[PDB]
Ligand binder design. Structure first.
Ligand SMILES: CC(C)C[C@H](N)C(=O)NS(=O)(=O)OC[C@H]1O[C@@H](n2cnc3c(N)ncnc32)[C@H](O)[C@@H]1O
Ligand SMILES: [Mg+2]
Ligand SMILES: [Zn+2]
Length: 860
RNA sequence: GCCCGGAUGGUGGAAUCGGUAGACACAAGGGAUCCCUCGGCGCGCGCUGUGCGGGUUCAAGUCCCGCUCCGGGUACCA
């Protein structure tokens, strides 16, 4: 043990030891109690940034802690390797997506090894290899056989010249991000998984996930959006087809004053033939973007169809309009408007002078005031013929029933959740195992032909995908005839939905999952990833686990017992617009900034001389180039400093705006820990401790040690407030540095304390603690050392602190034997001259005593 | 727009079930890796102070009603 702490002479040594003894490689040991601690797997984007560091440090803190409690901990790592970025990056780099990705993986792997996360590298997976995606192919063909898969027309973003489909990240400020041509809606048939067949189960089972946070549970209920209502069918005067709408407010029906139909609805197309105002508005509607966001800010717009639908309870002709907020693709392409009682309908009717009819009374039973806005609150009905007078429940049921009677309405459960579109028309993904025969029939790729392998050795022109460009690739023979395979590939969420199960058995060749293995490990005891994955990934992940359950491959109902969503690590983001309108994101450390009197950024240049557009803080990521790589710091300070500082910044679940200021604190603290063990072990082996011979100064200090163990255990294991854990450990280190380490008792006691501190820091700063555990001569490798237990008999307190308030203002603090009555505390409180000062002239009207904590004398 | 979160000294944050505001740290200043000062306004004291406005309570960073700004997601970024 060198006096000075040189992490560079330590971290790599300890890292080689973990690779040689395979410390973190585990099996299905049934003699041990398992713990599966899983962190959401990285997309191999290029480099790690502090967002990954945060996520993976949290997971490793939990993994090592659980291992010290004596459990068999899987903590696996892999690469969620398909996706969009590799395509653009390939072109920009005169490469192909496959090798760019494998190098990215080689690199990030090395970065992860150098932060010393105790992964089971024997179970590493890469989702872009056929050894992986073959099973999702097979699986998807089983889903099609069970009737959970179908094809429908779906709106996509489409640069009409390049004739290529764009993701929404790629459409910008109107136009595309390549060139000056405007994106367009295009309806393209695509493959869908009926996640809506599992909607109720997904909704209901949220009430069983008592160790998931409510943020995520609510976000998911509201996303599923279950609803009971009615579907009403209308006839239309000079049109031989019916219209169907769905409403949750059948009670407001008699106030339906118009219908809206989608730009692409057949009726609007028929009408647009003879109406050039309508036709121009429909052609206008192709530029409506595919995205709830921009779809809901847009000005609401419409044209009258000229057609007139018959209200089936009043027999009153009501106009049908075409409107830019009703989409053929989601629902029946028609809605009914009740402007008196739906705010969006009010605003449309206000704009285009449509009749706004009130049919629901206010809470006190007079007619509502509709001059400024729709009345949305449920109420008694008037203006509603035979339904007048009924309350909300009643009117719902009578209108529903009348409507059923007539045979034009029906009750219906309905969800905001839509089925899951898994077709992409991009190269870099798992191919979808369907086939079209010469016939024209469609079926699954048969089993003798799985996996359908994506070729890796390609040249990419940007424009097309090479599996569509070469028409020989799609050629095959099925049922003894020429057949063509599908050249669309899977949504890369498909691979991130079952990886947690494959990590249990990654080299099993006989099928998707070794169920013995999978059931030993599952369910995941803790799942750690970003709050960004609240809905999408986490819904598909649960949906998929259920589908595997229904296939009989896993016993659990839910995949993950506890979920821990970390906050996002944020960074400023900047760009300049290039020569042909390409956005060029610049990194914060290249950006020269002049700043507000309040701290907000006012101007910004790069070194080369470009006015940057400042976009604010946002998640670190390669997309916007605002990632800070940890690699520089690790080589300056050590992995243990970077790790400690991340966990000390802020609590795991809070979103953190990254800053560099603060690392020295972490580095200096580690030098003090090092210096303390060094000075203590340099002096030799220690006497056995004599618990009950201690000075009172020693009893006090042994109490703070044991109280720290209790708090840190709770902070890591139950609260996951790592910052407070670390803070409690610093406090203690501060007292330990002031304790004289001189007689044998002091030295025995410092040994206990230090053995405990070192073990407690271990999950956070394992390289330094592995080393220090050897200088203190602890048993074996710290990686398997037992986690420390607080001795209750050391933590007994004799006295406690009471705050004395007077009308709620603190006037003193007093120590008072724990065993103290209210009468005792008043008296003592009375002795304080500053309390006395505020009791003269006045009377004690009331007294509040919170046992052992606070006295408040309420005073006139 | 809609759904979910957030805001505390120059800075990151602490206060775990409504009960001491600023633990533990970074920066800064002064002194010899160690000390010491460190919310604001005016001394071994008083007032005030948790984004803004009201409210409940003996007591509010915490709870109630109404807002601003910031971030996450919004179904083809992952
Ligand atoms: C399980 C699948 C859907 C995860 C996906 N491959 C993914 O999110 N990959 S990732 O972006 O490389 O992230 C890996 C994990 O780190 C979290 N994370 C990313 N970016 C982050 C920022 N900027 N701050 C905090 N956390 C970030 C992400 O949520 C993943 O959990
Ligand atoms: Mg602030
Ligand atoms: Zn284009």
């Amino acid at each position: 043990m060198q006096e000075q702490y040189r992490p560079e002479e330590i971290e790599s040594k300890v890292q080689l030891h973990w690779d040689e003894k395979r410390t973190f490689e585990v099996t299905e040991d049934e003699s041990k109690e398992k713990y599966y601690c899983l962190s959401m797997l990285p997309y191999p984007s290029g480099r790690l940034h502090m967002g990954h560091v945060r996520n993976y440090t949290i997971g490793d803190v939990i993994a090592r802690y659980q291992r010290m409690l004596g459990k068999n901990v899987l903590q696996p790592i892999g690469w969620d390797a398909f996706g969009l970025p590799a395509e653009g990056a390939a072109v920009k780099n005169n490469t192909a997506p496959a090798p760019w990705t494998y190098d990215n993986i080689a690199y990030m792997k090395n970065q992860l090894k150098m932060l010393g996360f105790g992964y089971d590298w024997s179970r590493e997976l890469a989702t872009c290899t056929p050894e992986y995606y073959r099973w999702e192919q097979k699986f998807f063909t089983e889903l099609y056989k069970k009737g959970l898969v179908y094809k429908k027309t779906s709106a996509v973003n489409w640069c009409p010249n390049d004739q290529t489909v764009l993701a929404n990240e790629q459409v910008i400020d109107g136009c595309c991000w390549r060139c000056d041509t405007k994106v367009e809606r295009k309806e393209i048939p695509q493959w869908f998984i009926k996640i809506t067949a599992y909607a109720d189960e997904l909704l209901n089972d949220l009430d069983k996930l008592d160790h998931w946070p409510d943020t995520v549970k609510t976000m998911q209920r509201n996303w599923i959006g279950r609803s009971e209502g009615v579907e009403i069918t209308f006839n239309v005067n000079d049109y031989d087809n019916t219209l169907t709408v769905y409403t949750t407010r059948p009670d407001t029906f008699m106030g339906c004053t118009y219908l809206a139909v989608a730009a692409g609805h057949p009726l609007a197309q028929k009408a647009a033939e003879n109406n050039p105002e309508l036709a121009a508005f429909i052609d206008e509607c192709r530029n409506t973007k595919v995205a709830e966001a921009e779809m809901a800010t847009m000005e609401k717009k419409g044209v009258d169809t000229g057609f007139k639908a018959v209200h089936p309870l009043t027999g009153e002709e009501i106009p049908v309009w075409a409107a830019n907020f009703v989409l053929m693709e989601y629902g029946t392409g028609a809605v009914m408007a009740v402007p008196g009682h739906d705010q969006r309908d009010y605003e449309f009717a206000s704009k285009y002078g449509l009749n706004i009819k009130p049919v629901i009374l206010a809470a006190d039973g007079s007619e509502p005031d509709l001059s400024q806005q729709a009345l949305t609150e449920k109420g008694v009905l008037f203006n509603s013929g035979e339904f007048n007078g009924l309350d909300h429940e009643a009117a719902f049921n009578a209108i529903a029933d009348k409507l059923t009677a007539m045979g034009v309405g029906e009750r219906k459960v309905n969800y905001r959740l839509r089925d899951w579109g898994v077709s992409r028309q991009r190269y870099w993904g798992a191919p979808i195992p369907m086939v079209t025969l010469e016939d024209g029939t469609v079926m699954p790729t048969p089993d003798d032909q799985l996996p359908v392998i994506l070729p890796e050795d390609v040249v990419m022109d940007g424009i097309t995908s090479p599996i569509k460009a070469d028409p020989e690739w799609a050629k095959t023979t099925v049922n003894g005839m020429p057949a063509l395979r599908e050249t669309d590939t899977f949504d890369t969420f498909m691979e991130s939905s079952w990886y947690y199960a494959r990590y249990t058995c990654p080299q099993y060749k006989e099928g998707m999952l070794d169920s013995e293995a999978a059931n030993y490990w599952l369910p995941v005891d803790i799942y750690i990833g970003g709050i960004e994955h609240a809905i999408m990934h986490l819904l598909y992940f649960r949906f998929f686990h259920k589908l595997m359950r229904d296939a009989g491959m896993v016993n659990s109902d839910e995949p993950a017992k506890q979920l821990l969503c970390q906050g996002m690590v944020l960074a400023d983001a900047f760009y300049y617009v290039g020569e042909n309108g390409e956005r060029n994101w610049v990194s914060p450390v290249d950006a020269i900034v002049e700043r507000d009197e309040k701290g907000r950024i006012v101007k910004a240049k790069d070194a080369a001389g470009h006015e940057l557009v400042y976009t604010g803080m946002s998640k670190m990521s390669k997309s916007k180039n605002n990632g800070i790589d940890p690699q520089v710091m690790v080589e300056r300070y050590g992995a243990d400093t970077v790790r400690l500082f991340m966990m000390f910044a802020s609590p795991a679940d809070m979103t953190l705006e990254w800053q560099e200021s603060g690392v020295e604190g972490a580095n200096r603290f580690l030098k003090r820990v090092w210096k303390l063990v060094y000075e203590h072990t340099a002096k030799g082996d220690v006497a056995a401790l004599n618990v009950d011979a201690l000075t009172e100064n020693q009893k006090a200090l042994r109490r703070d040690v044991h109280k720290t163990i209790a708090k840190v255990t709770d902070d890591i294991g139950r609260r996951q407030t790592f910052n407070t854990a670390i803070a409690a450990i610093m406090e203690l280190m501060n007292k330990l540095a002031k304790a004289p380490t001189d007689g044998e008792q002091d030295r025995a006691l410092m040994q206990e304390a230090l053995l405990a501190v070192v073990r407690m820091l271990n999950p956070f700063t394992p390289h330094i603690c592995f080393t220090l555990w050897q200088e203190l001569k602890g048993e074996g490798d710290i990686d398997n050392a037992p986690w420390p237990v607080a001795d209750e008999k050391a933590m007994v307190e004799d006295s406690t602190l009471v705050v004395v308030q007077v009308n709620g203002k603190v006037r003193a603090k007093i120590t008072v034997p724990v065993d103290a009555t209210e009468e005792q505390v008043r008296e003592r409180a009375g002795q304080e001259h500053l309390v006395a000062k505020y009791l003269d002239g006045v009377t004690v009207r009331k007294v509040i005593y919170v046992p052992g904590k606070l006295l408040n004398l309420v005073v006139g």
